[PDB]
Amino acid sequence: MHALVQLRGEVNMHTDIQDTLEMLNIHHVNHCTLVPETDAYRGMVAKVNDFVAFGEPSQETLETVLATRAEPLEGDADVDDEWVAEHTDYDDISGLAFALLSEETTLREQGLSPTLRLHPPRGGHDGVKHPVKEGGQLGKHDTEGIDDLLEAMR
Amino acid sequence: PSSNGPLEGTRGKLKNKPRDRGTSPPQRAVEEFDDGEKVHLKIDPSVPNGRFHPRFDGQTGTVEGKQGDAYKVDIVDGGKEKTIIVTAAHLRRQE
Amino acid sequence: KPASMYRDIDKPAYTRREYITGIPGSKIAQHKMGRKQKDADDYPVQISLIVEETVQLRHGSLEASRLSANRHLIKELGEEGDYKMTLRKFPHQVLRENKDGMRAAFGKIVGTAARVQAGEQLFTAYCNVEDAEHVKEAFRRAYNKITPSCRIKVERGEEL
Amino acid sequence: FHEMREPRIEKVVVHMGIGHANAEDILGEITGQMPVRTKAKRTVGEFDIREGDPIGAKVTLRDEMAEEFLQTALPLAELATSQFDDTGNFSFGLDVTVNLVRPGYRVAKRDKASRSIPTKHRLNPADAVAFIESTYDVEV
Amino acid sequence: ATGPRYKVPMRRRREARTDYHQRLRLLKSGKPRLVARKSNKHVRAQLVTLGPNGDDTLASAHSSDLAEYGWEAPTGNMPSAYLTGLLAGLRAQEAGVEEAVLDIGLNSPTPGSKVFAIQEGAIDAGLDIPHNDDVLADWQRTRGAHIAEYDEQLEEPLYSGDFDAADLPEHFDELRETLLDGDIEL
RNA sequence: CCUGUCAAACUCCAAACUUACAGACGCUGUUUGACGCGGGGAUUCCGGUGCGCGGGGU
RNA sequence: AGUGCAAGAGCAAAAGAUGACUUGACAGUGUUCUUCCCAACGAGGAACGCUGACGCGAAAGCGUGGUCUAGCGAACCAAUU
RNA sequence: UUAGGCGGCCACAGCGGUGGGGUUGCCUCCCGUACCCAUCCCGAACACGGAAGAUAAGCCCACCAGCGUUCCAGGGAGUACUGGAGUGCGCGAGCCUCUGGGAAAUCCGGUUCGCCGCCACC
Ligand SMILES: [Cl-]
Ligand SMILES: [Cl-]
Ligand SMILES: [Mg+2]
Ligand SMILES: [Mg+2]
Ligand SMILES: [Mg+2]
Ligand SMILES: [Mg+2]
Ligand SMILES: [Mg+2]
Ligand SMILES: [Mg+2]
Ligand SMILES: [Mg+2]
Ligand SMILES: [Mg+2]
Ligand code: NA
Ligand code: NA
Ligand code: NA
Ligand code: NA
Ligand code: NA
Ligand SMILES: [Sr+2]
Ligand SMILES: [Sr+2]
Ligand SMILES: [Sr+2]
Ligand SMILES: [Sr+2]
Ligand SMILES: [Sr+2]
Ligand SMILES: [Sr+2]
Predict the structure, then answer these.
(1) Contacts of D115 in chain E (CB under 8 A)
(2) Which end of chain D is more exposed for a tag (fewer CB within 10 A), N or C?
(3) β-pair partners for E45
C-alpha cells in the first residue's frame, strides 16, 4: 500500500495522465490517496510518476494523517477513534490504519472519502522539477522520505 | 497517399514471410464457426478469394451468420458498426 | 560551396542509385595507401583518426584530408615506406542543391558525402615504432581539413 | 544382392535434329516402331520464327525393340571413355542414346510416393562401361 | 535446406502422398470422404471424416479381411476391389454414415478402374455418393469375367496356388450374396 | 580465402510503441438515466505556438 | 521462369506450359464492403449470395472475364431490345 | 504400425551420411500384356493381371550434426533504440539524469536428424 500525493498541477499535463489521477480519486494538487500494490494499480502510478509523490508510509504517520485529514463520505465530521469506532469495523484509528497498510480494506469501504485533502508542506517540498534521486520531490520515496512529506503536509 | 486504391500501402500486410510462401493448408479454409464466436481477421496472402478490405486487418469481430460458404462478421470501425463478408481462410478463432 | 550546407545529418538517407541519376564521381583517388600487399597485423603500431562528432563529410574534404595526410607520409617515409594507411568510409549519401523560388524546390544532384557517427575511425594507419610520430603528424594535418574535432588514438602502442 | 543391382537398358532414343520431316520414314524402318515429331522454343535467327513447329523426330525404344536395335547399332559406333554420362549413360553419332539404370528405377518414375534414386544406387560410368563392354564390343 | 529463405513443402507433399489442391475441393462438400487406395497385392477403402487433430476413420475395409467371409481368391483384382468397397460401405452404414464423396488420391480416373469399382460397391451398400455410371466398369468385368476368359487362353494355369483351374467369378456372386445378407458379423 | 563500406522507394532479424476483442481493478451510470436513438438551433471549413516525430529548403 | 501493360503483391502434382473441349465475357435479383478510415455523399468497383439457364469434370468442384489493386461518366434528348 | 491408410502442425520435420530389417504375413522393387485403360513414340508412365525372384532402391527401425532450421544458458548488453518527466549540460547538430520498456549482428556451450491425432494390423 502506497500513499499518492499530486504535487504538480493539471495545466499542460497530458490528458491520459490527468484521467488516471482522477481514476485514483485525486482531483486537486496536494490531494492524497491510499493505493494497494497490485499489477493494475502499479501500472497507474508509473504513468503518474512525474506529477506525483508516492511511497509506503509508516503506521504512525498514517495514523497522524488519518486523524487530521480523513473525512466521512459526506460532511465535516472529524475522524477520530470514537468516529472510527461507531462507523467502521475497527476499534480506533490505529486499527483502521493497520488494515489499510495490510490491504484488508479501503477508506471508501469504511464510509470514508477516498481522498486525504492535505495542507501545503510546511517548510516547503524539495521541488517539482526533479525526482527523489536528484534531490527533487517527484516520484517514488523512502518510507522515511514519504513520512517527512506527509507529516509536513499534516 | 499518391493513389487511393484498396491495396494502397498494403505492401507489408498482404505479403508472406518467405517460409510461409506457397499454397496454404486446407484445414483452416474449411473451419466451421458458430454465431457469436469471436474471430480474428487476417488476410492470408496465399489465398486470393474471400478477402475483406485490407483496412480491417487486425479486427476481432463476431460471427453473426453466413452468406453462402463465406461468413458475415460484425465489427466496429472506430464508432461505426460494419458487417464483413469473409471466408474461413482469413479467420482465426479467438483464444 | 560551404560545408555548413551539408555537414549535419538533417535529411533522410538518400543513397538508392536505382532512383537517383546524374550523381557526380568521387574525388577520392584511393582508399588503400602505403604498402597494400603487406598485412595490417604485420605492424607493431596502429593509429586511427577518430571523429568526435556525428557528421557528413563531402568527398571533396575526404580527398583533401586524405591527400594532405598520405602526402606527408610519403614525404617523411618515402614513396615506398614501411606503412599502410586506410580510409574506411565511403561517400554513400547523395547531396542536392536547389539551384522558380521555393516552387518545385527539390534540388538537383551536386555531390556525395560519407556519414560518420561520433567516435568512429575515419582513418587508420599501421606503422613501425620509429615512424609513429610522422603518422601522428599526418593525422594532425588531416583533421584540419574536416568539419569535426578529432582524436589521434593509438590502438597498439606500448612503445612510449 | 547382385541381381537387384545389375544394370539394364531403360530406353534407347534415336533422334534426328534437322531444323525444318522427310526423315521420319528412315527411323520407322530402322527401329521398328512409329516415330514422333520434335518442336522448338524461342525465336531463332536461323529462320525459326515459328515457335511450335517441326524440326526433328525421335523414337524411344524399350525392351526387345531396344536390344534388337542395339545389336546392329553398337557395331556402327566407335565408343569412347569421354562419351559417357556421369549417370552411366552415353550418346553417339542421327544420334543414338542409351539410358542405363539399376532395377528399382520405377521409384522415381511413378506417380504415388515417388522418390529420387540415392547416389549409392545410381549407376556409375565405370559400372556402365563394364556392363556394356560385357556384351559384344570394346571400350575406350 | 539451402538457407532461411528456403521453402520446404508440406510433409505430405514432400512424401508425394497427398494432393492438397484436390483435397480442398474434396473437403468443400462437407460430406465424409470414401478414401479409395490401392496396393500391389491389396485394396483398401476408408470412410474418413474431418477432425481437430487430423482425419477420423469411422469405418473401413481391407481386401485382406475379405477372406474372413469365404474368399479363397487373390486380393488385387476387380471382384476384390468392388467387394472391399461393399464391405466398407456396409460397416459405414452401421456407424451412421449415410453419404460420402469419392477420394481417389493420386490414382487416375480411368474408366472401369478399381477405384470406381470400390465406389460402386460402397454405393450398393446403401451409401449416397456422387458418381457417374458410364465411368464404372461393365458388371461382368466387376465379377472378374475378364480374368476367367484370360484363363480360358490356358495352356498354362493363370493362378499358381490352386484356387481352381478355370477360375470362378461365381465366387464373387457367392461372396456378394453373403454380404448383402442381413446377418453377417461385420 | 582474406580485407573496406552502405540503403526513403533492401530485409535472415527486430523493438519501444500504436492498435482489435475479452476478463479483472479502477472510475462511472441506474431520483444527477449513463451507453444509445430521434428531432430543433447553430457556429465553423484564413488559425497560431511549444514539444516529439517528421518531408522540402543553405 | 512464366503469368498482356506501372509498381507492389499472389501462384509449382499451379494461378505457369502444352493439349483438347468450351463460351459463365450468360439472364434476373440481392447482401456487404469500397468509392467517402473514423463520419453523411452519386456514378464506378469488388467480395459474397439466391433464382434461371449452361460449359467442363468420374466427382467433389470450378466458371458472375483476364491472379490482385488503374482502363471511367449525371439529367434532358436520340437510336436500339 | 516385423515395413500399412488418412491426416494435423507444416524444416524441431530440410540437406548430407552410417548401421539393421522381411517363406505362404505387410509395403515395395518385381514378373507379364487377354482384357478395362493408356502413350501426339514407347504396358516407360497411366491401367489392368499376377507372384519366379529380391530386401539392392523405396519404405520402416536405430544413430551421426558437417550445412540449414527450432528452442535454451552464459557473453555481447540493460549496450543500440525507446513511451513519460526535467529552469540538467551544449554556440549548435546534439547530449545527460530520473521513471517504464528493451533489441540485432556475433561468440560460446547445449538442443533439433520431427512431434501429435484417427483407423487398421501378431
Ligand atoms: Cl471488407
Ligand atoms: Cl493409392
Ligand atoms: Mg465531503
Ligand atoms: Mg515559509
Ligand atoms: Mg524551488
Ligand atoms: Mg511501409
Ligand atoms: Mg444536354
Ligand atoms: Mg443508339
Ligand atoms: Mg540395406
Ligand atoms: Mg541550453
Ligand atoms: Na501460405
Ligand atoms: Na515557374
Ligand atoms: Na455504388
Ligand atoms: Na504435332
Ligand atoms: Na532395402
Ligand atoms: Sr531537414
Ligand atoms: Sr576540425
Ligand atoms: Sr503510428
Ligand atoms: Sr479472379
Ligand atoms: Sr513391366
Ligand atoms: Sr526486464
Answers:
(1) 16
(2) N
(3) E36, E61
